[PDB]
Design a protein around this ligand. Structure first.
Ligand code: HEM
Length: 443
């Protein structure tokens, strides 16, 4: 019973709901100062124990689901979203069976095919912009990412079936507490047409899937990985299971990729020098005529890579990873009891003053010298770390770098009247005047 420091509260049940909810990052920064790397506090009935800093976060990253449980906090968040027999509604071994099926289909051989497809979808979409004007970038990315992701993981049959009609039918699907995401100004009807997309979208897949079943167009696309995929008991995945796995893979990468793409642009629309140094790198690595991209070139676009890593450092779309303690855990000379909701914050760890120089500046060149991203284990964890890591990370870098390149080539970006959008935790539904960006064609 040697429990970590616990921040007390004068408000019985809500605890620190207001203080924390007002600014979670500032709250936790202050808590690390006052209380150390492992602190507890009550919020709306639950005791939360945060692991702050790399050395404390090591507990969760090196943990097993039998001790720190995701299916005890992340299951009824996701199950109404992804479906039955898929995601956190199945036993971990068969859960991890499908995850190993997904990770096989997300390989370099496919990433080489994916880079062309992403550019075509970007070129036909961003033509809507025309010559010059101003767009809502968060909304712009939301729509583009759906198309790009759909035309890579779902196939061409399902892309053919896709129209501007269904793009927001994912929004009601997205609605269904859902994950500690960074708040953003994406289209937020959330309700849209609940219960209706579940029929529309699911049957969109059944039909497309049957075209691949009774036919001999066995191709190398992600869907053909799942149709031919067999469990380790021989039985292959059913019709509804394959659809659930594909729907869920586009949703887990939607807001994440969209929010990051937008923030990086805003960060580059603020610093015009870096936006030029990037364009230099583009025509210098690919040639001045800007020929179509391919996987290989992406690996040497290092400035873009360091801008993306710096974006993910300051604006990680997953704000907090959470687990429920089923067995007592030991960290920093403390024992976390059964029933605590153990939390790691990539945002905090990637901002901690005792680990990052110029913590709040968007400085991509910090990776050219020493930094915590390589010099520490769990100080830079946008995609997670260790045993708990994003399987879409490889597709993410490919998708994001291809998209941003296709943008920085065909456009230049700047802030409208100098407006740089800020995240507000105090505005429940009343966002401050929406985020807009300025675009103008190149040359
Ligand atoms: C900037 C982009 C992204 C970030 C920062 C991100 C972040 C994360 C993180 C931190 C996790 C671990 C959550 C946890 O263990 O509690 C995760 C899991 C996952 N992500 Fe992402 N992700 C991104 C993009 C994507 C993409 C593009 C896909 C799919 C194409 C995707 C699919 C998944 C899936 C399937 C999981 C599995 C959840 C599990 O392990 O049980 N994500 N992501």
């Amino acid at each position: 019973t040697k429990c970590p420091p616990y921040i007390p509260s004068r408000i019985p049940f809500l605890g620190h709901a207001v203080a924390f909810g007002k600014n979670p990052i500032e709250f936790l920064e202050k808590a690390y100062e006052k209380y150390g790397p492992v602190v507890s506090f009550t919020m709306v009935g639950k005791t939360f124990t945060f692991l702050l800093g790399s050395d404390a976060a090591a507990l969760m990253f090196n943990s097993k689901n039998e001790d720190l449980s995701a299916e005890d906090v992340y299951s009824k968040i996701t199950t109404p979203v992804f479906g039955k027999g898929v995601a956190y509604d199945v036993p971990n071994p068969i859960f991890l069976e499908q995850k190993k099926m997904l990770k096989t289909g997300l390989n370099i051989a496919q990433f080489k095919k994916h880079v062309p497809i992403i550019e075509q979808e970007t070129e036909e979409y961003i033509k809507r912009w025309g010559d010059s004007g101003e767009t809502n970038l968060f909304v712009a990315m939301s729509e583009l990412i759906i198309l790009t992701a759909s035309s890579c993981l779902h196939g061409k049959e399902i892309r053919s079936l896709l129209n501007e009609k269904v793009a927001q039918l994912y929004c009601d699907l997205d609605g269904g507490h859902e994950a500690w995401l960074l708040p953003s100004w994406l289209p937020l009807p959330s309700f849209r047409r609940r219960d209706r997309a579940h029929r529309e979208i699911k049957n969109m897949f059944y039909t497309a899937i049957q075209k691949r079943r009774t036919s001999n167009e066995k191709v190398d696309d992600f869907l053909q990985t799942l149709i031919d995929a067999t469990y380790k008991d021989g039985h292959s995945l059913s019709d509804d299971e394959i659809a659930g796995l594909l729907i869920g893979l586009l949703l887990a990468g939607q807001h994440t990729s969209s929010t990051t793409s937008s923030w990086m642009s805003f960060f580059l629309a603020r610093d015009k020098q870096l936006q030029e140094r990037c364009l230099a790198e583009q025509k210098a690595v690919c040639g001045e005529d800007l020929p179509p991209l391919d996987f290989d070139q992406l690996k040497e676009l290092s400035l873009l890579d360091r801008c993306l890593k710096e974006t993910l450092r300051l604006r990680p779309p997953i704000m907090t990873m959470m687990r429920m303690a089923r067995s007592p855990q030991c960290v920093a000379g403390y024992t976390i009891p059964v029933g605590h909701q153990v939390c790691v914050s990539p945002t905090v760890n990637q901002r901690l003053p005792d680990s990052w120089t110029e913590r709040d500046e968007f400085n991509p060149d910090r990776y050219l010298t020493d930094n915590a991203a390589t010099g520490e284990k769990f100080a830079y964890v946008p995609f997670g770390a260790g045993r708990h890591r994003c399987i879409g990370e490889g597709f993410a870098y490919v998708q994001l770098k291809t998209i941003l390149s296709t943008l920085i080539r065909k456009f230049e970006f700047d802030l409208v009247d100098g407006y740089f959008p800020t995240i507000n935790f105090t505005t429940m539904i009343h966002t401050p005047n929406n985020p807009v960006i300025r675009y103008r064609s190149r040359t």
